[PDB]
Amino acid sequence: AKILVFDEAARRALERGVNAVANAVKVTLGPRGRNVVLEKKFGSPTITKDGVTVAKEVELEDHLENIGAQLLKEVASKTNDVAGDGTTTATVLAQAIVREGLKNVAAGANPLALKRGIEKAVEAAVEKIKALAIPVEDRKAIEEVATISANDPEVGKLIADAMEKVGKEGIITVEESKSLETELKFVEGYQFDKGYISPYFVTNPETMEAVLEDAFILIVEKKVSNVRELLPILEQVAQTGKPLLIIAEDVEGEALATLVVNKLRGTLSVAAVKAPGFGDRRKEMLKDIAAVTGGTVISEELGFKLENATLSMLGRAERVRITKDETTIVGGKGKKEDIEARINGIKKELETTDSEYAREKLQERLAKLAGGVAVIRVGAATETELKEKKHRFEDALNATRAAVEEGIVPGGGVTLLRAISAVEELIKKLEGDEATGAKIVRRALEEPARQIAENAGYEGSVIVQQILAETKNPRYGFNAATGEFVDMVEAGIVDPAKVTRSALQNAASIGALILTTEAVVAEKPE
Amino acid sequence: AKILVFDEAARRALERGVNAVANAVKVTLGPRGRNVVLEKKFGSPTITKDGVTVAKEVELEDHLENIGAQLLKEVASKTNDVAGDGTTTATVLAQAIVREGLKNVAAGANPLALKRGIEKAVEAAVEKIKALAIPVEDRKAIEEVATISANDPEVGKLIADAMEKVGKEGIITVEESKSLETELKFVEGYQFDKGYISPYFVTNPETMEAVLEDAFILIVEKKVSNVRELLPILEQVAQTGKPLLIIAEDVEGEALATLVVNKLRGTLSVAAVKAPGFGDRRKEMLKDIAAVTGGTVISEELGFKLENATLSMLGRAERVRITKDETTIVGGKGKKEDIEARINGIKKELETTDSEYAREKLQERLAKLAGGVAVIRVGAATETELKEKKHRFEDALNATRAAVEEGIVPGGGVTLLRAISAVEELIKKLEGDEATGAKIVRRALEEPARQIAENAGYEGSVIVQQILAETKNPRYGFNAATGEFVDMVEAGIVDPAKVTRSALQNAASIGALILTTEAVVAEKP
Amino acid sequence: AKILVFDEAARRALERGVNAVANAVKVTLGPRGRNVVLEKKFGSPTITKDGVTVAKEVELEDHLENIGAQLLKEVASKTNDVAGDGTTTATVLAQAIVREGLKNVAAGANPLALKRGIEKAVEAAVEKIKALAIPVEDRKAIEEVATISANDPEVGKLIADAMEKVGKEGIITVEESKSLETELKFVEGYQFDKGYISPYFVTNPETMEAVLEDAFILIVEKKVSNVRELLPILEQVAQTGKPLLIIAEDVEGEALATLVVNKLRGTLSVAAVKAPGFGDRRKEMLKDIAAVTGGTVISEELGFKLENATLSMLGRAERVRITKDETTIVGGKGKKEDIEARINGIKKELETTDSEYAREKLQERLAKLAGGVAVIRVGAATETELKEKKHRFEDALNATRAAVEEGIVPGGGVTLLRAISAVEELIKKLEGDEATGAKIVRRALEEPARQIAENAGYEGSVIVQQILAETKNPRYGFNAATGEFVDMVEAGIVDPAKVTRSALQNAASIGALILTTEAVVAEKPEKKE
Ligand SMILES: Nc1ncnc2c1ncn2[C@@H]1O[C@H](COP(=O)(O)OP(=O)(O)O)[C@@H](O)[C@H]1O
């Protein structure tokens, strides 16, 4: 029992959703976001100033409107997913683009033409972001960036060192130490891009992660779907009192169902994750895990049933962190020999490799194993003070890492504003509805800056003007925090150019999507 | 299926909740609070005059409005949590601040500016509370304070003595004696800031505590989540007929589930508490416990499984008291040797220590082990009369202890009133909406005093005036109890300056929060 | 049936209404202002840019909110009454004063004091307006005032042209032309809207006119129906060989039949035309006609018999045109002193006339007598366009009038911005809420300048700052039409000091009142929930 909806009817419904999210989220953008209250079904209410936190809690009653909300949240988040920030900024830009877009379409503008224009606009914008970016590759550079985003010259050093040694494609993590001091330690471990097969395996509802400490790592290679072939090992581990991380190529049917039940029951704290990589590439990576873990790849190939698996064929580590997009293994306890075994065998095969693509990938396995897993044990005094430093340091890390990828640009929306000039120049060479699109982007670009100042209790439009007024130094901007105009850079208010380029491109993507939408097939109230 | 709400729509909703609580609560403020009737689903109705009692029972049907009520209750209670009182007073102040705040915001005032001013106002107010605070450090001082908060000159003495000997950073506890007399004894024991992992471990529903007498103290270091590795020791202790206190770094899954079931079942009376401190700091404190208890830290480090734990590796004490925020061990039966062993090894490492922070903390461990554990065995006659004295004396203690940290000020709202002048001076240097905020706080400050007189059946505004009239002695105030103006201090109507400073700062926090609220995402019915 | 609303509840409601109207209006303010579309009961709608016109159409469903809407309308109209222009400006200033003020009331300020301060602040403001006023002294100065008020160069031109060739004491009229084009035309001699009492009088068959060259004017107050009384003069004239125009309350019966027959005969060339006005004014006008032609009025109440009339007491003119409904006496031979004394009798009488209607009647007389009557016939392709184009002319005139009266000041709200420094100085001498009151005006004074710039696509606050910034030459302002800061006066962006002063005084009058509200007694929403 579906329900069809076409043309403006549909686009307007989606927009409604888009606005629901965007309006709740943008009140937090900038140094002085406003408070958003979220109520928990059981616990008492919560108050935030974090866009992502609020975005997660936004779900609308109406199917069609919700579809828009979800659709926005998705594309918006895939910004934080590649730069660890700017998910809220992408939402704001998107709202604007959607609004003006639908307005002009309703006034007779051609959707496709608007799109062609919105795209050309963004290109020009991005190109300005680039030519405006400050590279961060020096030692001092990387440290300073992190030092700021963390607000701790020490953690800055650590983050810098951690990167210095593990490398760009290396592994770095922030762990909640128990000690009251923050230190940097280079343990053994691995990390691949796969996450919990079921959101029920989550340990912490807030962070949406599944944290396992001192657990076994059952490394399978088959599709574990039968309970009978799993109960044996599941039992041995049950009596161990320890948690279990399953890394099969997939866990479905009974298998996955059981794992989830006992997990939510308290019988056994587990978490299933799909095997890293694909094809030949995968078994090779499953071994990399067994090596650093001290377990063995239970492959049906070398003939071996699961039920006959010993509570010793499965390696283990000090801590395992599972995200919906990534699995991390800290404290690998495999034989330092097996590990160096892969590292070398990987280098040998690296000389025999000819395709640049294959090379880069062996490179990452090489950098994961070697260098290992730079860990930043975070010291606190309160469970509270910890969550704080934990978050702060973690972000500072993601920030800095992104910062290195695409340089940095002036923050506080200022970079997006400087992009306007580039869009203006484009418009002068454009005409028709296409030019209108370019104009739409140009208007959008003002929102972030404006919204920040606005949230801070200032006249958005006014500040945005005074900023665009200064043409001398493009780094000239408004620091909504102190309420003064300064050099955003020299004021330590910067953003990973990667984050900005993304938020924009993503927002513009959602916009183009909706303008090009001619129908939506939703589910009728079940 | 959520439900968004923005701008004034939201703020007004929250305010509705804020008022629901506040209006039910404030009718109890002061020496003559009015009666509030609360019905119990099963038992017959209840009547109170206690703000906190009433606040707990306030839950609204509307999600949005309730959100406000809960939000208030939280911030309001985190005053009683740091001073053991003034939760109701913080509520009243908050109601006022929220009202005037929203009013002026609706008239076009800038929220942030109002905040900036509400803040500056509080500062100046607090600063006056301080400069007006009565220090409690004398012998008579500390005794009198406690004597009052306990309503027992004897317990006052004991509390005074207990503090006199164990010291500021020392350990003091109130235990439910079996004797019909109240005494002070200086045993052996420990105490850390961690409570029952599950509210189901509670022994007394009223006091919300978990009291275990002559129990074993299974000191673990791993995350006990498996039943198999716990059943062995759980069984040995089960046949002992004695209770058990588990102090692992955490108890979850099956382990925590089983412990709770048998507890509520009657199979085994236990209670799980998380391990004190964090990190290296923690294992060091887990040993301090084993030392005073006569047990051993079951650490997987020194290689040792839990199932193989003997009913002798776990020390024991005469009584263990568990609160949702604190665990107390009275009657430590560890070898007097193992104890003095930590005391000295702690002093040696204390000379090698250089960071002032690390020092102060070894200081508390040092004061916990040494001085010991001043215990106040509480004598009663009824299980009822006991819970009462228990609570009363315990609060009196916490009150007095806090009273020593930050001095005392005139009660009956009078101190808050004296803060007005400070706010006035501030306003004269302020302008715009910022000045308005300051004015909001200034108006709020009158509520407590006013409300008290009101509840007592007098003209609030009138009394509040006659008080602000006298400029000579700031301790001049109205005693709603006798219906006469007197020296609040010399009249024994004082308040821990810490309590007051908190209630204000907290209320003003809720206020600023709501004014800065632009949206709320609630769950649909 | 009533509902009693107090405190903030009441003020907010009122404010909602105030803003409802004000925001519909402000959309028009300035050169880049746009139009509002007012639905009419039957025909096409009204498409204006005029404050009061829009304001008057606004009617809110909620009683309290509506009361607010009304109070604001009053500000609009009373300003239109006192100056005919600057209604939008007054609305904006009122809105501004109401919000900034209502805020302060919520903050605990005493409204009464706020009022006193507002009042004092306005006085100081007005005084500064006068202080910057420049007297209108030439064709340019006027072309400017008009071009602006109408927001059209062309309109400003014709108004200047006409105004010039009709003197500042003249009279200009706006009429509905028939072609697509607008035309400016002057009325030569004395003329009134009465035509030939009988089509037979016609002289030209191609123009349906009655042209009498060098003729005698017979001015009879009473009617005329009896042939007898006429014959004596008709013979005297007939023998003169000259044409004759007879002006009497009416010419009927055998008396008219005579003139016609003789006319058609060739006996005597004549034409009859009813008296100009009515009541005592056509009596006073006949005399006007008298003084202009030179003849004598056969005043039935001065003691004159038509039968005893003489060529000695007849009016004489160089020419006479009579259309189906209009009469024009060209080249009247009247005595100069008779005219002037006839004129200065109206002047030395206007200075005692109140009802603006009586001042308009006693003005078209003094206009005719000064042969100074211009008329702009506005053309357009559609009724809707025309009705607005027509209106713009009317506003431009009202402006011009006011400009001549109290002077001219720099436009674009610039002049009111300059009033700020005055209120500022005043504040330094004020205390308490009274000082707050003054501050309210201080802020309000920016609204006009802001909204103009705003509706043009600029930052209100920004522009107002740069203006208030350069304090060397008060004539410094922003040209919201070109987007450049300039000397407002030199740029030709000026406003009649009268409208400015009025707008503010009216805005401030209602505004302050509102701030003193503490209760409202309205109708309980009839059958609603
Ligand atoms: N080009 C211009 N630049 C700056 N101000 C202008 C310009 N044209 C008109 N104005 C100003 O706009 C104002 C009011 O315009 P208008 O829309 O006609 O409303 P109102 O009913 O108040 O007269 C005046 O102060 C006038 O001088």
Ligand SMILES: [Mg+2]
């Ligand atoms: Mg006008």
